[PDB]
């Protein structure tokens, strides 16, 4: 069967960090569900791009489990994810079931807020490092993409393709990742 | 005295090739208008991402002129742009006023359809080369980003950041382009 991905979209999310992973995962044959944190209504991203989710998080939550839960970045978006009780429950369940969790840029700070994967080696956007490291619950890395077991993190818009392809490789293998990468015309 | 950009969004547009330039140009302080070819309704992109435009092309065309007209890629999206009489007029007017025109991936094939910038050195996604070169009205290039005068072209999702930063440099200068680039965490 095909793998399934849950992408949680909140107001203030970085649209590039949201669209690149959604697009690339779909190119990989992954069934991606773009779920709106606040509901079914369209979401105004950080640079004012308006994206309409496939469904509300409340409804997508009932259609689990997912092979990967993806948390986009964006300072305000990540803050909304960090303050969400629904997100806390989703991440704890994913962590418990040994499912992959992927967060990019400011996105990883949501893991800290919900006490997810403590002890993991992680990376974040440079400007989110201090927030992520508050309390020293993680070990910091400057790698563009960092994968420690079931916790996959990345740094920013410019690492979004690498981040997405890492998710594809983790779920569908290196072969599929290479096949999906070629047509993108990456460096 | 901010610059203005018009991004024409049609069904089937490559969402990454649309969102990356929109986001990056806004980071550059450019006033970007995402105009829906078909109207004000949300647009279903190539990988099913739904984006709601800022306005319809019909209304956006009335608020011209723009310092740059941007044509996203996506096979089906570029086809729709190529068939549009409204797009033909907008591009001819921009070319006449000596304004910048930027197209990425399959996007440049719309230039051929509307007989824009013949004689220019251009690039496209590899799979769109034959279509673009039908009749030999352009000279092909494999450069990731090609700029011949007021005709700026690029190759695909993976060259979207380079494409967007080239637009920023052309409109706001290399200083601003560098400032905008740094926080993106590009390789």
Curated annotation (Swiss-Prot), chains A, B:
Changing residue 17 to D: Strongly decreases enzymatic activity. GO terms for biological process: adult locomotory behavior; androgen receptor signaling pathway; autophagy; cellular detoxification of aldehyde; cellular detoxification of methylglyoxal; cellular response to glyoxal; cellular response to hydrogen peroxide; cellular response to oxidative stress. It is found in: Cell membrane; Cytoplasm; Nucleus; Membrane raft. It catalyses: N(omega)-(1-hydroxy-2-oxopropyl)-L-arginyl-[protein] + H2O = lactate + L-arginyl-[protein] + H(+); N(6)-(1-hydroxy-2-oxopropyl)-L-lysyl-[protein] + H2O = lactate + L-lysyl-[protein] + H(+); S-(1-hydroxy-2-oxopropyl)-L-cysteinyl-[protein] + H2O = lactate + L-cysteinyl-[protein] + H(+); N(omega)-(1-hydroxy-2-oxoethyl)-L-arginyl-[protein] + H2O = L-arginyl-[protein] + glycolate + H(+). Coiled coil: none annotated. Its EC number is 3.1.2.-, 3.5.1.-, 3.5.1.124. Changing residue 45 to S: No effect on mitochondrial translocation neither on deglycase activity. SUPFAM superfamilies: Class I glutamine amidotransferase-like. The keyword Glycosyltransferase does not apply. GO terms for molecular function: cadherin binding; copper ion binding; cupric ion binding; cuprous ion binding; cytokine binding; DNA-binding transcription factor binding; enzyme activator activity; enzyme binding. Changing residue 148 to A: In PARK7; loss of protection against metal cytotoxicity; decreased detoxification activity on methylglyocal-adducted CoA. The modification Cysteine sulfinic acid (-SO2H) is found at residue 105. Changing residue 45 to A: Reduces protein stability. No effect on oxidation. It comes from the Eukaryota. It is a lipid-anchor. The modification N6-acetyllysine is found at residue 147. The modification N-acetylalanine is found at residue 1. There is a cross-link at residue 129 (Glycyl lysine isopeptide (Lys-Gly) (interchain with G-Cter in SUMO)). Deglycase activity does not require glutathione as a cofactor, however, glycated glutathione constitutes a PARK7 substrate. Induction: By hydrogen peroxide and UV irradiation. In pancreatic islets, expression increases under hyperglycemic conditions. Expression is also induced by sulforaphane, an isothiocyanate obtained from cruciferous vegetables. Changing residue 165 to P: In PARK7; strongly decreases enzymatic activity; reduces protein stability and leads to increased degradation; ubiquitinated by PRKN leading to its recognition by HDAC6 and targeting to aggresome where is degraded; interferes with homodimerization; abolishes interaction with PIAS2; reduced localization in lipid rafts; almost abolished detoxification activity on methylglyocal-adducted CoA. NCBIfam families: not_thiJ (TIGR01383). Multifunctional protein with controversial molecular function which plays an important role in cell protection against oxidative stress and cell death acting as oxidative stress sensor and redox-sensitive chaperone and protease. It is involved in neuroprotective mechanisms like the stabilization of NFE2L2 and PINK1 proteins, male fertility as a positive regulator of androgen signaling pathway as well as cell growth and transformation through, for instance, the modulation of NF-kappa-B signaling pathway. PANTHER family: PARKINSON DISEASE PROTEIN 7 HOMOLOG (PTHR48094:SF12), PROTEIN/NUCLEIC ACID DEGLYCASE DJ-1-RELATED (PTHR48094). This is Parkinson disease protein 7. It comes from Homo sapiens.
